[PDB]
Amino acid sequence: LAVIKVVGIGGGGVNAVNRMIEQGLKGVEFIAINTDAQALLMSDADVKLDVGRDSTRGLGAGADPEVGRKAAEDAKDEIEELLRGADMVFVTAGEGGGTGTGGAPVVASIARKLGALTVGVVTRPFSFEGKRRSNQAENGIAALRESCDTLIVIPNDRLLQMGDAAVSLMDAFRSADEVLLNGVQGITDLITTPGLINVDFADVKGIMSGAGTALMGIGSARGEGRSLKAAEIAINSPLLEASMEGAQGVLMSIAGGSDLGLFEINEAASLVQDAAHPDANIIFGTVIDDSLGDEVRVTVIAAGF
């Protein structure tokens, strides 16, 4: 039984972790790291960690990656203790800010030296947030990639092509929350709550260790030929580029109720096998989830380029 910790660092990461908690992501410990005491108050994470300066006083708002990086190393001993003896560590953040952008590569480096399989799950900022954030996020991703075994990057721009035409500025970030959850849960659920086609940690570790940069796709469908449709949506998801075939490795999960048909599972499995490069390592499994009813959702992670 695996020890999996999910770290949400910076404002966005903490909000993402709250969505995960709110949605009932199980079998994982949630850690919230921030510089701001006030924002940490609204967090529902098991473990919270205030860092850097007091938010109750001076400059909480400034978004400097250098500030966030320094704050992290001033807490390296405390962080290491929170990640003590974990088998897997997820580092979720919204790239572009200060706390997340600079702090994340530190948290990951620590988790990796502890010997844990280190998976970063971050978002690229929306273009409407300006080039300054686009720039910072770009360096923050370069850095975090060095510290992770695998780094899944979700381009926020593509979420707007999926969400409704008339969405608020707040609905936009709720989608960002939801997709970060999708990334994490799509992987952890394979381990914590497997179905008929059982995948164990060793399989996942094999496909994700030193994988480098990675991308994800999600899909879901109902009733009539659902599993195939869901799988098809996932492999064609805009979040995943055309570069599904360019992947060295593919991790795939299909979640559904206890009554998830073997035939269904097989059709999804076959589709991904055909869609991926002939030489790619493909590991795939099923997840039991009664909260889905008669809907099934497929997650595809494509790694190694």
Q: Known binding site for GTP: residues? A: 11-15, 98-100, 129, 133, 177
- Regarding 72 and contact with ligand GDP (CB under 6 A), the answer is no
Distant-in-sequence contacts of 58-62, Cβ < 8 A, 24+ apart: 60/35, 60/36, 62/98
Considering the rule CB under 6 A, would residue 5 count as an interface residue with ligand GDP? no
Token pair belonging to 189: 């659920």
Which residues from 99-138 bind ligand GDP, rule CB under 6 A? 99-101, 123, 125-126, 129, 133
Breaks, C-N > 2.5 A, in the chain lie after: none
52 binds ligand GDP (CB under 6 A): no
CA distance 278 to 128: 39
Taking CA atoms, 253 is separated from 26, 159, 276, 288, 298, in Å, by: 16, 21, 15, 11, 6
Residue choice 16, 107, 141, 221 for contact with ligand GDP (CB under 6 A)? 16
**Least distance (Å) between residue 181 CB and ligand GDP:** 9
Nearest residue relative to ligand GDP (C-beta): 94
Q: Which residues pair with 281 in a beta bridge?
A: 249
Task: List the structure tokens of 52.
Answer: 């850097």
Task: Check residue 12 for interaction with ligand GDP (CB under 6 A).
Answer: yes
Q: How far is the CB of 164 from ligand GDP (least distance, A)?
A: 17
The candidate with the shortest Cα–Cα distance to 145, out of 191, 114, 106, 105, is 105
15 in contact with ligand GDP (CB under 6 A): yes
Options 11, 120, 195, 304; binder of ligand GDP; rule CB under 6 A: 11
| Residues tagged in the binding site annotation | 11-15, 98-100, 129, 133, 177
Q: Which residues contact 130 (CB under 8 A, 6 or more apart)?
A: none
Residues that bind ligand GDP (CB under 6 A): 10-12, 15-16, 63, 68, 94, 96-101, 123, 125-126, 129, 133, 156, 173, 176-177, 180
